[PDB]
């Protein structure tokens, strides 16, 4: 009986996140199609994403439940088709600002996609089902990225005919998004805890660590273009992302098998992997050889994703499902006030306006300071 809302909800998930034109984005933008100087992309367009993401996070979390979860999944499906329709024909610097804002809805409505399964599926088939709707997404993005590089390299297909595939992909994700059964019970509308030492401490690291990761993942495609321009040499943006995401997926899976009490060896295993990111982030900025630049990204994504699993596992050990939304909803929101303040100072045209060349030397110093405060705190 649970196979009907997991076949469609998963089918919607896979096709939505199978976007071949995610890796070849900046090389697509700063090309012969929508020529935009790198100073117009790293300081005027990209920052708008986090501004809109933060604004449309509480209003979409609260709406997602005053209405069903499927309605917001359909609101995320339409915002997938607008964003990628303006990215096809929309040109300028002002239009791309709108595109980012719509992309704010695309990813700020992602809360309504995971949380949907809880309401319509029997409670006992939750942990097992959540894996199906999470493991499928990673398979989609990995399959999408491989397809991008395996075509641009052997098929000689221009970057423009990658967003067409992306638009066709999301356009068929939407067609399914109408068939999920309309849930008949919400969590809060239609149905203090932080005092615990472990929850506050573990959650704080989750907020800080993800805030720096969303920023890197944002401004870590200009750097590759900066070190080796797309118009002068071949770029393996797709292969790197596919291997990187796969590297992350395996790391998350491994943390779920090795049985070690993450209480006495948690903080040390947290700082040790935090200085792996800070030590793997400077490598991006101090090397001229492009190949080394990817190797830094392979380590960073896999290493960090091996920490979010530790944080996620420790946060949710005494919390019931109904509590998940209000503890991973205020972690996903607090982590954005951190990014927005960081993007208004380190990147945005209003603030220091630092270009990408000097920009990564800050994030490398960002993950490095999270270790100093989470390691020297253990004094006596």
């Amino acid at each position, epitope marked *: 009986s649970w196979i009907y809302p997991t076949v469609i909800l998963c089918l919607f998930g896979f096709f939505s996140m199978m976007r071949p034109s995610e890796p070849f984005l900046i090389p697509y933008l700063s090309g012969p199609d*929508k*020529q*935009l*100087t*790198s*100073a*117009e992309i790293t300081n005027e367009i990209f920052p708008v994403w986090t501004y809109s993401y933060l604004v449309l996070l509480l209003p979409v979390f609260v709406l997602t439940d005053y209405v069903r979860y499927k309605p917001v999944i359909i609101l995320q499906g339409i915002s997938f088709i607008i964003t990628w329709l303006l990215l096809l*024909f*929309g*040109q*300028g*610097v*002002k*239009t791309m600002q*709108v595109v980012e804002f719509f992309y704010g809805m695309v990813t700020a409505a992602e809360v309504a996609y995971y949380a949907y399964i809880y309401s319509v599926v029997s409670p006992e088939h939750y942990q097992r089902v959540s894996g199906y709707c999470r493991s499928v997404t990673l398979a989609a993005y990995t399959a999408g990225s491989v397809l991008a590089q395996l075509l641009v390299s052997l098929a000689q297909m221009s970057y423009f005919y990658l967003n067409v595939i992306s638009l066709a992909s999301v356009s068929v994700a939407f067609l399914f998004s109408l068939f999920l059964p309309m849930p008949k019970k919400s969590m809060f509308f239609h149905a203090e805890c932080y005092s615990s030492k472990r929850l506050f401490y573990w959650s704080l690291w989750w907020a800080f660590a993800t805030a720096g990761f969303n920023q890197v993942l944002n401004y870590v495609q200009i750097l590759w273009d900066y070190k080796a321009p797309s118009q002068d040499s071949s770029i393996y943006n797709g292969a790197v992302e596919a291997i990187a995401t796969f590297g992350g997926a395996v790391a998350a899976f491994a943390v779920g098998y090795v049985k070690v009490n993450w209480d006495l060896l948690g903080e040390l295993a947290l700082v040790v992997f935090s200085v792996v990111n800070a030590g793997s982030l400077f490598l991006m900025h101090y090397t001229a050889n492009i190949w080394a630049c990817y190797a830094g990204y392979l380590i960073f994504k896999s290493s960090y994703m091996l920490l979010i699993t530790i944080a996620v596992f420790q946060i949710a050990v005494n919390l019931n499902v109904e509590r998940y939304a209000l503890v991973f909803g205020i972690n996903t929101f607090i982590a954005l006030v951190i990014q927005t303040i960081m993007t208004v100072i380190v990147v945005d045209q209003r603030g220091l306006n630092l270009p990408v060349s000097i920009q990564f030397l800050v994030y490398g110093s960002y993950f490095a300071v999270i270790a100093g405060i989470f390691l020297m705190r253990s004094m006596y």
Partner: nanobody
Amino acid sequence: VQLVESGGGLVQPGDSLRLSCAASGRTFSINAMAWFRQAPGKEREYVAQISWTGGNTYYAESVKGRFTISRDNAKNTVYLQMISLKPEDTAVYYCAADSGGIRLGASRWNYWGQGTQVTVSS
């Protein structure tokens, strides 16, 4: 916007020139002005760029170091200063103004100029 280009002429290599672009009619929205070049029997080539609100510039790799593009909003012209011409720089120069606002089209640059001829030979 009605861009009008002038300042071309014939000169030996190693001779500097300045080109202007008197955009006029709809200045209030011009968010860039990038010069373009088309050598005989060839295709348009990127040559320069200048934002209007600020002063960021981005020159083509081949022409960098000798081409400087400077804005003058008071009269709305855009000056491209070129130094050290070579016997393979011969071409015609075109302006390209980005008006502004949300648009759906084939190319970012909305309005273009007519064309000025630069001939470097002996």
